[PDB]
Scaffold this active site. Structure first.
Site, PDB file in Angstrom:
ATOM      1  N   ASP A 195      10.459  13.314  12.529  1.00 26.06           N
ATOM      2  CA  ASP A 195      10.169  13.194  11.094  1.00 26.06           C
ATOM      3  C   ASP A 195       8.798  13.471  10.841  1.00 26.06           C
ATOM      4  OD1 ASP A 195      10.964  13.229   8.420  1.00 26.06           O
ATOM      5  OD2 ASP A 195      10.692  10.922   8.531  1.00 26.06           O
ATOM      6  N   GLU A 231       5.303   2.892   0.105  1.00 22.05           N
ATOM      7  CA  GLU A 231       6.695   3.521   0.438  1.00 22.05           C
ATOM      8  C   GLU A 231       6.477   3.981   1.524  1.00 22.05           C
ATOM      9  OE1 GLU A 231       8.815   1.327  -1.286  1.00 22.05           O
ATOM     10  OE2 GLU A 231      10.622   1.900   0.027  1.00 22.05           O
ATOM     11  N   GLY A 232       6.885   3.480   3.058  1.00 27.20           N
ATOM     12  CA  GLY A 232       7.167   4.186   4.157  1.00 27.20           C
ATOM     13  C   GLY A 232       8.507   4.735   4.193  1.00 27.20           C
ATOM     14  N   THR A 233       8.683   5.479   5.263  1.00 25.82           N
ATOM     15  CA  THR A 233       9.894   6.175   5.538  1.00 25.82           C
ATOM     16  C   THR A 233      11.201   5.010   5.610  1.00 25.82           C
ATOM     17  OG1 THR A 233       8.767   7.755   6.840  1.00 25.82           O
ATOM     18  CG2 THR A 233      10.935   7.457   7.241  1.00 25.82           C
ATOM     19  N   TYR A 234      10.884   4.041   6.505  1.00 22.78           N
ATOM     20  CA  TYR A 234      11.999   3.128   6.714  1.00 22.78           C
ATOM     21  C   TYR A 234      11.770   1.373   5.927  1.00 22.78           C
ATOM     22  CZ  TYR A 234      12.760   6.118  10.516  1.00 22.78           C
ATOM     23  OH  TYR A 234      12.819   7.222  11.402  1.00 22.78           O
ATOM     24  N   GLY A 235      10.670   1.622   5.051  1.00 20.85           N
ATOM     25  CA  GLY A 235      10.450   0.550   4.399  1.00 20.85           C
ATOM     26  C   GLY A 235       8.800   0.359   3.615  1.00 20.85           C
ATOM     27  N   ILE A 265       0.768  -1.189   0.060  1.00 23.60           N
ATOM     28  CA  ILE A 265      -0.033  -0.172   0.100  1.00 23.60           C
ATOM     29  C   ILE A 265       0.908   1.165   0.032  1.00 23.60           C
ATOM     30  CG2 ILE A 265      -2.194  -1.009   1.137  1.00 23.60           C
ATOM     31  CD1 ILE A 265      -1.185   0.101   3.622  1.00 23.60           C
ATOM     32  N   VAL A 320       5.035  -0.577   3.179  1.00 26.19           N
ATOM     33  CA  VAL A 320       3.969  -0.984   3.950  1.00 26.19           C
ATOM     34  C   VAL A 320       3.011  -1.815   3.201  1.00 26.19           C
ATOM     35  CG1 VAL A 320       2.036   0.282   5.089  1.00 26.19           C
ATOM     36  CG2 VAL A 320       4.063   1.306   5.203  1.00 26.19           C
ATOM     37  N   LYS A 356       4.864  -3.246   8.361  1.00 23.89           N
ATOM     38  CA  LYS A 356       6.018  -2.546   7.730  1.00 23.89           C
ATOM     39  C   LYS A 356       7.222  -3.074   7.740  1.00 23.89           C
ATOM     40  CE  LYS A 356       8.319   2.030   8.533  1.00 23.89           C
ATOM     41  NZ  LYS A 356       8.175   3.118   7.411  1.00 23.89           N
TER      42      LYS A 356
END
Length: 277
Positions: free
Chosen positions: A125, A12-16, A10, A18, A32
């Site tokens: 962040d 691209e999150g901050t550290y990887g 669903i 999702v 995540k």
């Protein structure tokens, strides 16, 4: 992995990455998978511990962490799933949000933050993409505490002192981001959309004025402070803000103080007149 199916990517999150998923009970969660730059390095026990303690954050405006799954050079966090976020909402709201909606989101954002700050948990962040929203208008903050675990980059919500090399633990960093997000909710467009560290500072200073020793005592001790910064005077608040009454502008002005020692706290903001209207 702990038995999940229908893994749907669903975002691209901050550290990887999702995923939306279901367990074998039918319930929906967000997964995540933390992107490990160096696979072979491993994740130390200190890191796992600093993530696992985030399960203790139980607040209606903080995304609930259910589980931390560490198996074989893979780390997945299982979180409460919300279908919408503020970035995607603002992307279809021309001119930004109606004032009553922005106030509602701001209140909820500050409540989540205040809760975390009281536990010495920082975000560092904050940005619209990590403010999740459900069908009922509830806002929930994602990724609180992950910066302590894990440390092209969006600089738009970063405080000037952070941009100029400050490394100290401080709650003030988050309040700056809140101020930037508040302005973005009311204006539709991001307040300081810089393209580099240097340009990010110039975008801020062009609006709020260039710091000096008189309006920001001790600004000269920051490692990347530059005595040759172009000198800009502050613009009038009402000239770059739309749709904000006087209490709103006042509050915003307290969050965007350059000197972190004078910036309003989350709990102070919650007491502001803007919220009693």
């Amino acid at each position: 992995m702990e038995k999940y199916h229908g893994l749907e990517k669903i975002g691209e999150g901050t550290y990887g990455v999702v995923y939306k998923a279901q367990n074998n009970y039918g319930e929906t969660f967000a997964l995540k998978k933390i992107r490990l730059e160096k696979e072979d390095e491993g994740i130390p026990s200190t890191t796992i511990r600093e993530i696992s303690i985030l399960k203790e954050l139980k607040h209606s405006n903080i995304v609930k962490l259910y589980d931390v799954i560490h198996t074989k050079k893979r780390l997945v966090l299982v979180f409460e799933h919300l279908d919408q976020d503020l970035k995607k909402l603002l992307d279809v709201c021309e001119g930004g949000l109606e004032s009553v909606t922005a106030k509602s989101f701001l209140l909820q954002l500050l409540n989540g933050i205040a809760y975390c700050h009281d536990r010495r948990v920082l975000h560092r962040d904050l940005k619209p993409q990590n403010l999740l929203i459900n069908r009922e208008g509830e806002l929930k903050i994602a990724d609180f505490g992950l910066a302590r675990a894990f440390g092209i980059v969006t600089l738009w919500y970063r405080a000037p002192d952070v941009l100029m090399g400050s490394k100290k633990y401080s709650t003030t960093i988050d309040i700056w981001s809140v101020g930037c997000i508040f302005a973005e909710m009311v204006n539709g467009t991001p307040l300081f959309p810089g393209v580099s560290e240097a340009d990010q500072l110039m975008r801020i200073f062009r609006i709020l004025g260039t710091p000096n020793s008189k309006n920001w005592p001790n600004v000269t001790e920051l490692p990347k402070y530059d005595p040759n910064f172009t000198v800009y005077e502050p613009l009038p608040w009402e000239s770059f803000l739309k749709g904000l009454d006087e209490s709103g502008i006042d509050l915003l002005s307290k969050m965007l103080k350059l000197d972190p020692n004078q910036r309003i706290t989350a709990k102070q903001a919650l007491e502001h007149a803007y919220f009693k209207e």
